[PDB]
Amino acid sequence: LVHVASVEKGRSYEDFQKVYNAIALKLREDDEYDNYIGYGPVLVRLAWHISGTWDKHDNTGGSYGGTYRFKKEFNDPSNAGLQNGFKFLEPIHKEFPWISSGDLFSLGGVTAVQEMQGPKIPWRCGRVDTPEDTTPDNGRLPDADKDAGYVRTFFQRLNMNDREVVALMGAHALGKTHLKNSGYEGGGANNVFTNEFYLNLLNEDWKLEKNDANNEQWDSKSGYMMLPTDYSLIQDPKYLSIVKEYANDQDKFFKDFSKAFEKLLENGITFPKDAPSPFIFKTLEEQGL
Numbered sequence: 001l002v003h004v005a006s007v008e009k010g011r012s013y014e015d016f017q018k019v020y021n022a023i024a025l026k027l028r029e030d031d032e033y034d035n036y037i038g039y040g041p042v043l044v045r046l047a048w049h050i051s052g053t054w055d056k057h058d059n060t061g062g063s064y065g066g067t068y069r070f071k072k073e074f075n076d077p078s079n080a081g082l083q084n085g086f087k088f089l090e091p092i093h094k095e096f097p098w099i100s101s102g103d104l105f106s107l108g109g110v111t112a113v114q115e116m117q118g119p120k121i122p123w124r125c126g127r128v129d130t131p132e133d134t135t136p137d138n139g140r141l142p143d144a145d146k147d148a149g150y151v152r153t154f155f156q157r158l159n160m161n162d163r164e165v166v167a168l169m170g171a172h173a174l175g176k177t178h179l180k181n182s183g184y185e186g187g188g189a190n191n192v193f194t195n196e197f198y199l200n201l202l203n204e205d206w207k208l209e210k211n212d213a214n215n216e217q218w219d220s221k222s223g224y225m226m227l228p229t230d231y232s233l234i235q236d237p238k239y240l241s242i243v244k245e246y247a248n249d250q251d252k253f254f255k256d257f258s259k260a261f262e263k264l265l266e267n268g269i270t271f272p273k274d275a276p277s278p279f280i281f282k283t284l285e286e287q288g289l
């Protein structure tokens with residue numbers, strides 16, 4: 001099963017920078033969402049969930065087809081809460097209806113990371129909307145109530161190694177859990193991209209507890225929380241070494257996250273030899289906007 005990237009007809013870097021800017025301007029304008037966290041974190045999560053359905057074995061799922069727009073995927077219990085990100089992107093799509101759905105969802109995540117002061121994430125266009133019967137079944141996204149062995153095995157399906165996994169999980173510094181979405185709650189909240197996930201793992205005093213949804217989670221007396229899968233990154237000795245590396249080197253974390261996140265968003269896509277080079281978008285700040 002081959003998905004060849006096909007550039008939206010007549011579009012170039014400038015066209016996509018305009019879409020980036022519209023997303024970024026709306027992030028600034030709709031600042032009140034989720035108790036003033038804003039839409040940044042949920043857009044990052046949306047980009048990951050549309051990509052994380054991928055299966056390397058048969059090239060099903062992945063970001064290419066934009067299939068989150070169909071009810072089966074939209075209503076995946078694993079995707080509860082992401083409807084907010086979809087609703088955010090709706091007026092963007094109306095302003096730029098030429099962009100494919102997969103390109104819009106993935107660009108939303110890139111824009112959110114960069115506007116939240118994260119690393120630059122190179123991004124490629126050319127995802128093409130595929131029909132409803134290409135939507136992956138529910139159940140391909142990861143469970144949170146598991147251990148390091150589960151995490152490691154799960155991410156092999158996405159062709160991610162230990163370093164890539166630990167780097168990607170640093171996104172859990174962003175946003176927060178919501179009891180009504182996932183059965184996890186707490187840990188305060190944040191909308192600036194940093195390496196604080198790793199610092200909190202290492203520096204906080206953690207205690208395993210059951211929450212009000214009867215689910216296990218690790219809680220600190222500072223009020224932070226870790227999922228069992230988050231905490232597994234310091235229980236496993238191979239993950240722990242990488243956690244320490246990122247806790248002690250902000251730039252290295254940024255660079256490795258950028259590579260892993262681009263890879264995540266591009267898994268399953270075949271790019272022609274003469275496809276455009278990846279785009280690196282300027283932030284609003286860099287443009288004086």
Ligand code: HEM
Pocket residue numbers: 041042044045048080081142143144145151168169171172174175176177178179181182183184227229261
């Ligand atoms: C073992 C892997 C993972 C598990 C089990 C997991 C699980 C979860 C859960 C349960 C939530 C709470 C959702 C809610 O209640 O609204 C969440 C939120 C979030 N996840 Fe993950 N996740 C994983 C990997 C990732 C990755 C790889 C990324 C991105 C690179 C990511 C980005 C996010 C973000 C940004 C949020 C905050 C969303 C918001 O504030 O609305 N996660 N995740």
Ligand SMILES: Cc1nc2ccc(F)cn2c1N
Pocket residue numbers: 171172173174175176177186187188189190224225226227
């Ligand atoms: C601040 C914060 N953000 C997240 C995102 C996902 C997750 F599972 C936990 N998180 C915590 N504690």
